[PDB]
């Protein structure tokens, strides 16, 4: 039930200075890659990479640290251990809670502006509250897919473990036209469709 933490290594307008530390685990095809990033203000100056095996000065400001840390056999072996250690344990902790977390999307189809059925308009497909963020949104006019005229805004992260996207098609609708939004997500066995009638 408990998460693990490796401890960072030791170095060696208003006045403000910042230091940032990052312990990243890159999980891919049953493999873990560990990166320990040391950043002063916005400049990453020194880094440990499990793929490298040793510390590397990202910029010349990290030169003393690369030189020193690499001289200590303990620091090096401690770091090298991390992928099979902390990276693996924490990945294993996240079962269907984070690794397989699935939330179904809320699809709403509505025109951009209120007006007559002849002028130029945008048909908004507002797909909201879903996880993971990997999603497909297709536009269909009278059963045939509309590829051109799709104005999408980049996938939106709500910062509450849910995502949103607005996919709007450029349309000149005729009375009796059926516009269909088709959503493909990992949290659905069968795709969800929402139809819009001209009226």
């Amino acid at each position: 039930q408990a998460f693990w933490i490796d401890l960072f290594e030791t170095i060696g307008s208003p006045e403000n200075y910042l230091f940032q530390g990052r312990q990243e685990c890159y999980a891919f095809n049953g493999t873990q890659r560990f990166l320990e990033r040391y950043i002063y203000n916005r400049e990453e100056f020194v880094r440990f990479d499990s793929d490298v095996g040793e510390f590397r000065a990202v910029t010349e400001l990290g030169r003393p640290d690369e030189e020193y840390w690499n001289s200590q056999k303990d620091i090096l072996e401690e770091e090298r251990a991390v992928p099979d250690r902390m990276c693996r344990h924490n990945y294993e902790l996240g079962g269907p809670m984070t690794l397989q977390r699935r939330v179904q999307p809320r699809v709403n189809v509505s025109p951009s502006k209120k007006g007559p059925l002849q002028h130029h308009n945008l048909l908004v497909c507002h797909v909201t509250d879903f996880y993971p963020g990997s999603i497909q949104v297709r536009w269909f006019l009278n059963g045939q897919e509309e590829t051109a005229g799709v104005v999408s805004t980049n996938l939106i992260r709500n910062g509450d473990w849910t995502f949103q996207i607005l996919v709007m098609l450029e349309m000149t609708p005729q009375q009796g036209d059926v516009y269909t939004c088709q959503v493909e997500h990992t949290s659905l066995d069968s795709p969800v469709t929402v139809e819009w009638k001209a009226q």
Binding site: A2, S13, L18, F19, Q20, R22, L99, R157, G159
Partner: protein
Amino acid sequence: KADHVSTYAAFVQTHRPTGEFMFEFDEDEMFYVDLDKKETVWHLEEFGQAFSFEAQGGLANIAILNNNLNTLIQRSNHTQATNDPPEVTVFPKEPVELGQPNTLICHIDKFFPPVLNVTWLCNGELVTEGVAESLFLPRTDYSFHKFHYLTFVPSAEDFYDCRVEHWGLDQPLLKHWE
């Protein structure tokens, strides 16, 4: 190259927040160590229910990082980074339906340092209740972002503003909404 990215990101700075420690999975913050309350705070109910975390790891890394800052202020001949102004966006959580309760999200993005003031404004006046907010989220580009939330009920005779203050901003930015 990865299926998933699990990361611990902690910062330490002169101005407030003086320090921050958190764990994020695929850019979404899972948990953090309240450094003042000396307690682990989980982003979701189910998280803290199935998982545990030792706040001593949070604080200890903040202690290491505090030392590292001192050494680098010295090494860099007191180098202060240039103020990166934020990029503000206001958008509702769910599709807007007059009279149906919703949430207004304010995304403050692409700024440095993580020193910021954020106040919600309804019809010109400050709104203190039904308000929530994120931590100073550390972007992969060593810049920062934050989320602010306001529970609201959509009405035609209403207007919203996300009032932001940052050192790289000459006048407080107002980002208006319907």
